[PDB]
Amino acid sequence: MSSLLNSLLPEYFKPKTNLNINSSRVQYGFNARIDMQYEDDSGTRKGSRPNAFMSNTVAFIGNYEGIIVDDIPILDGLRADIFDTHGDLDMGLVEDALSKSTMIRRNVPTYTAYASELLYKRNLTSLFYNMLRLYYIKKWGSIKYEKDAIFYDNGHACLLNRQLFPKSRDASLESSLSLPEAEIAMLDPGLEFPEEDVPAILWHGRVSSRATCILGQACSEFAPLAPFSIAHYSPQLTRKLFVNAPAGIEPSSGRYTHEDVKDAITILVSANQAYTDFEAAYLMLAQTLVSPVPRTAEASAWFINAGMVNMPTLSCANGYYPALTNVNPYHRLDTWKDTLNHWVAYPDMLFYHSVAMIESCYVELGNVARVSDSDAINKYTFTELSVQGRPVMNRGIIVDLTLVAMRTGREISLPYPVSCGLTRTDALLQGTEIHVPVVVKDIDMPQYYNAIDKDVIEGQETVIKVKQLPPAMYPIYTYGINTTEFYSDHFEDQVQVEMAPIDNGKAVFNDARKFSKFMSIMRMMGNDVTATDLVTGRKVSNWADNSSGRFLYTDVKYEGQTAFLVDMDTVKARDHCWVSIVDPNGTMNLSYKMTNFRAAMFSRNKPLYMTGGSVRTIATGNYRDAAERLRAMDETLRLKPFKITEKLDFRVAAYAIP
Amino acid sequence: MSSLLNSLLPEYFKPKTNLNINSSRVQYGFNARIDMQYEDDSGTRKGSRPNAFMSNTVAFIGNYEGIIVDDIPILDGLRADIFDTHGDLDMGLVEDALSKSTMIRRNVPTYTAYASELLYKRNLTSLFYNMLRLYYIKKWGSIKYEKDAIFYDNGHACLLNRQLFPKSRDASLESSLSLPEAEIAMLDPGLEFPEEDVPAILWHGRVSSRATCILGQACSEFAPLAPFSIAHYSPQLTRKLFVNAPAGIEPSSGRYTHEDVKDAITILVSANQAYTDFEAAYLMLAQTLVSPVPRTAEASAWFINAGMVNMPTLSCANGYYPALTNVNPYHRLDTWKDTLNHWVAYPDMLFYHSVAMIESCYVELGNVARVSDSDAINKYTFTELSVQGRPVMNRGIIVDLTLVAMRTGREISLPYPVSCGLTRTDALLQGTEIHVPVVVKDIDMPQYYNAIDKDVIEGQETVIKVKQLPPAMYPIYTYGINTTEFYSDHFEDQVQVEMAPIDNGKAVFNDARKFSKFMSIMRMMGNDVTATDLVTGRKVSNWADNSSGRFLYTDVKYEGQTAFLVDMDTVKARDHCWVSIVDPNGTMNLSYKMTNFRAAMFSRNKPLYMTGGSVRTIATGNYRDAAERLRAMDETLRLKPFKITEKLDFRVAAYAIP
Amino acid sequence: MAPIDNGKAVFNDARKFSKFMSIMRMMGNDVTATDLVTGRKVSNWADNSS
C-alpha cells in the first residue's frame, strides 16, 4: 500500500528515484538548527547550535523463519457477473458463467463441483513475496557479512555477530543462497480433472527461457548461510506449477539479471489480475527488508528469539478455468492498481517506506512496554480493541498497522483483512527477564550495566539482565507529528525545573519527573553529568546514546521507585555553546526553537547521495466512472487509533479512546 | 432444513467456510471474562479471570445400526397438471398425460394399469444419505481410532474404548470400509411390463465413469471395522439399480475424489426433481455425524446399547415414466431448494449444524429425565402433545425436532411429516438400571461412585449402577437464551450462606437449591470443596468435571433427604487465577458477572482456527434477483475509444478516457 | 504503588510518611524503614504508652 507508507515520510523530504546501497548499515537523520535561551536566579544567557545531527542506524541483518499457514481468499480479479447484488460469491451464477462461455456443455456439472472447492482458497501473495526477494538479492548482491564484526559498541560493553547469530559463516548476499528449481510443467487444454495440491497460473504469449528459471526458484526452499533480512529461511511453496500458455514453455536457462525478474512480475500480475495479491506482498516485505540497530545495549533483547513470518499457502485455479477471469474484473477500491504502478516505476523507493514502517512500530512499542497490566488497553488486549473486521487471527500485518495508527493518529483501512507477515510482539508477551550476551571492554562495566558477575576482566564474555524492554529507536521521520512527554520531541518547548540544594558537592533528586527535566536541560547545553541511583547503587549517565542527542528515563535501567544523588563537582564539558553554564542557581528555564531541517544519509562513515531524477506523483481518484459509493463496509479491515493521556506517575503510560 | 438449524447458532458466532479437522475429538466452547467477588463481615476479596474457557468435548465415534422401515411417499417433484385441487394424484389425468407424450403406443395400456402402485413409490432419502456419508469419508479420511485409548477419565474412574466397543480393530476412517459395488444396468425403453421391487432413476446426458462407482457403492452394505459415526452399519439398499440414460452407462472407474460425489448429487437432484428428499437426508446426517463425550463417568449409560437408525426403503419409479417429470413441478413451500443450495456452497457448515442439534437434544433430555411419571407432560407422553401433524410413528427426526422446539421455545415447521433418522430416547423409556463398566485408578473409589464392590485394588474392572440418567452435555451455544434454575446458566448470580461465629467453620445446607450454587461458584474461584451427607454417609466433590467447570445436583448420584455438612477449614486451592478463603467469620456472599463472549475451538491440545470466506445467510430472493436481472446487458461487443493527449516530453504517450 | 514495583515504596513527602507509619502501628504491624541518603533506620514501634 504505497499511498499509506508514502504519507509517513516528513513533508520537507521528497526522495529521488535511485539509491546505490553498498553496505549492510545505513544512518538516516536530519541537520537541524537549535536556538536555546537560558534564564535562572544568577542571570540570563543566550546561545545557538548551528548544525546538530539527530539520526538512527538501520541494518540488513535479522534472524527470521517462515511458516506456511491457511489464510482468507482474495476475491479480486474474478468477473463481476458471478457476484450477486451484495459482495458475496454465489455458486448459482458460477454454473451460468461457465455454461455460456463454451460449446462442450457435458463438462459443466464437473467444472462447477471443483470450482466451488478451489475459489475459497486462492492466494498468490507468497509467490510475489519470493519473486520480490529474488529481485533485491540480484540488485544489492555485493553486501558482505563478517562474523567477527561489531553489532553494538558504546565503550564499556560490546556485542559481536558471533553472539546473537550462532550457526553462521562469512559470505556475500549472492553467495548466501544456492536455490534449486521446481518442475514448471505445461497444462495441455483437454485435461478434465484438476490434479489436487498443484496451482495453475495464466501467462501472456510464450514463457521466456529466463522466466522459467525465476518461477522455478521462487517456489523452491530458501536455506541461507549468513543471516540476511531478504534471504530468511522459507519452507517449500509447491512441488509442481502448471502454466496455461497457448505457446509451449522453453527449458530453464540457469542465469537471469535483476531486470528479467521485473518482466516476470509485470506479466504474471496482468494475466491473472492479481493486483491486490501484490499489495499484500509489498507491505509484507516492508516489515522484513530492514531491521533496527539497537539504541542502547539493553535494546538487543528484541532480536534474540527468531520472529515467525506467516507466509500464506499457494493455491490458484485460473489456469484450469480461464472463463472466470475476463475483461470486467470485480474490485472493492478504485485505487486497486496503484501499488504495482508505484513499484514498477520506482523500485528503490521500498527502502524509504520500510524504514518509515519499522521506525513507527519500534517507537510506539516503547510506550506499550511501559503500560501497567491492570488497565482496559494493555499489551495483551490492545490489538483486539483496535481492529474492526473479521480476520483469521490478530497476527502479522494487523499488529504492525495497529501500531502505525497509534503513532500517526489516523484511521488506516485495507480492502481485505489479510493476516500475513512478521509478528514482532514475542519478546514483549512473556513475564521473564531476557539474558543478552555481552563482551567486557572496560574493567568498570559492572557499575553501569546489571551484570551477573560483579568482578570482570577486559576480554571476558558475561551476560546482562533486561526486565523491561527499552525503546530500540528514537523518532526521526515521525518527529513532532504527535508529541508525548516521554520522548519530548517538540519543535518549541519551555522546560522549567527547580534545582535541589547542593549540600557538600551532591544534589538529591527524590522526584522522578524533576530528575528527567534536569538531565534533559544539561544535555541540550552539553554537560556530561553522572548520578548514583541510591537503591541499586549503579551509576546513570545522560550521555548514553551519541547518535540521537536526547535523554530518555529508560537509560536509568531500573523499573520501580528510587532517589538519585547527582555529582555536581565532576560535571565535564564535552560540547560547549555560549548558552552552556556549569553552576545552575534556583529555578532553571530553557526555551529552544528547532528550524532549517534537511535530510542526510551516511553509509560506511561517508555521505550516501541519492542519484537519478525527481519522483513525479502517480495516484488515482476515488471514482473512475462510478456513480454511487456502495459503501460495502462489512468485510473491510479498519484500525482505530489510541491517544496517550499523561498522568502524575510519569514512569507508567496509559491509553484512552479519542 | 438449513434455515431452522442456522438460527440455533449464537449471535457472536461468525462462521467461515473451511474447517481443517485432523482428529477424532474437538473441544468447541467460548472465552468469557468472569469478575468474581467474595463479601464478608471482615472485608471483600475481588478476583478476575480474563480468559475463562467453558467447553463441551465432541467425538467422531458412536455405535449405530441401520434398519430398513416403510415410510410415507414424498410427492414433491411430479408435474402440477396430474394433481387435483385437494393435492393427490387424480388418475385419469395420468392416462391423459401418458397418451399425449413420446411413449411407445403398445406400452400405454399396460403401463397405465401399473401406475396405481408405482407412482406412490417416491422416497430417495436412503440414497442421498449414503452418498453424503461417502463425501465426508473421503474428505476427513486421515482421522485415526486407537483400540487402547481413553474414552473418559476423571482421576478416580477410567473408561477405555475396549470396554464400550468390543469386536473393534484399530484403523483409519479411509481403511475402515471396503464397499462392494452393486450392478448399475441401463433401462431398455422398449420393456414389456415394468419390474417392481427394482428402482429406476433419471440422469442428465451420459453417466460418467466415476458416477457409476459412486452409485454402485452408495446402494451397498456398510460393514465397518472401527466404530465410526459416518461409517456405521447399514443394510443393502438394493441389489440392482436401473438408470434411464439414452447415452450409455460407462463402466466403473474404481477410484474417485470427494469433489466427484458433489457432481453425482447435483445431477441426481436436478434430473429427478427431489429437493425435499435431500432436506430429509440432510437432517438425518445432522443427528448422527458426531456423538458427545460424556460430561461425567456415570453419563456413559446413554451410549451402552446401540441406538437404531430408521432408513426408509429405496423406491423410485421415474425411469418408467419420463413424461410425468418436467420443468413445472408441484411443491408445497416456495423455499424448497434452500437446503441443497446451502450444502453445495458451504459443505463444512454441517459440522456446526450437527453440534447445535445434539447439544439442544442432550441438554433437554437432561431435565426431562428429572420429572415424575404421575404428570401430564412426562417421559412417555412429551412427543404426542407437541406434534400437530400425521406421522406414521413418533420416531427418528420428530423426537429430535420436538426437543429443539422445547429448548429454543419456537414453532418448527416441515413440509412433509417424515419419520426417519436416529432415535435417542431409548435408555430413558426403558426405566431400568444400566451397568456401565469402569477400570479403577485410586483405591478410595466406591465412596464417591455407587459401585458394585466396596473394596477394589487399583487396575480392577468394576461396574457402576446408574439409576437416574445425568445430563450428557452442558448448554454452551444455548447459554442464557431459555434459562432454567437446574443448569443455572445466568450472566449474573449470587448465593448467601448464613453462619455464626459460635460455629467453627461447619455449615449444614438444609436447602438443596443454594447448596448447588455454593459448590458451583466455589469451583469458578478455584477451591476444592468436599461435602459429606449426614443421613446416608456418602461424599460429593465439586471437582467432578474438566470441561464446563460447573456443579450440577445430579453429581450426588443419590435422591434422598438433604443434610450436607461442609467443613470450611479443609478447602484447598487447586487452580490458578483464584480468590482465597483463608478464615471466614459471619455471613458469606459470593457473586460473579460474565461480560463478553469470543468463540474458540481446540483439537489435539492446540487451537483450531476457522479459514476461508465469510459465510452469508443465503435467501431464495438473492439468486432469483439475478434471474430477474438476467444480465439484460445485450451481449453486443461495444468497443469505446481513447483519445491520445500530448504533453511536455512528447517521447512517452498518455491516453485519456473521453 | 504500581504492580511493577515488588512491594518497595519510596516516600518523597515527609508528612504522609508520618501518617502511614502511625496508622500501621494502630493496626499492630512492625514496619522498619531505611533512609537512602544517610543510611540510618527508623521503627514505628518506638513507644509503649500512646
From Swiss-Prot, chain C:
Superkingdom, taxonomy of origin: Viruses
Family the entry assigns: Belongs to the totivirus major capsid protein family.
Known function: Capsid protein self-assembles to form an icosahedral capsid with a T=2 symmetry, about 40 nm in diameter, and consisting of 60 capsid proteins asymmetric dimers. The capsid encapsulates the genomic dsRNA and the polymerase and remains intact following cell entry to protect the dsRNA from degradation and to prevent unfavorable antiviral responses in the host cell during all the replication cycle of the virus. Nascent transcripts are transcribed within the structural confines of the virion and are extruded into the cytoplasm.
Subcellular location: Virion
Shown chain mapped onto the complete sequence: 499 to 548 of 697
Source species of the chain: Saccharomyces cerevisiae virus L-BC (ScV-L-BC)
Entry protein name: Major capsid protein
Underlying gene: gag
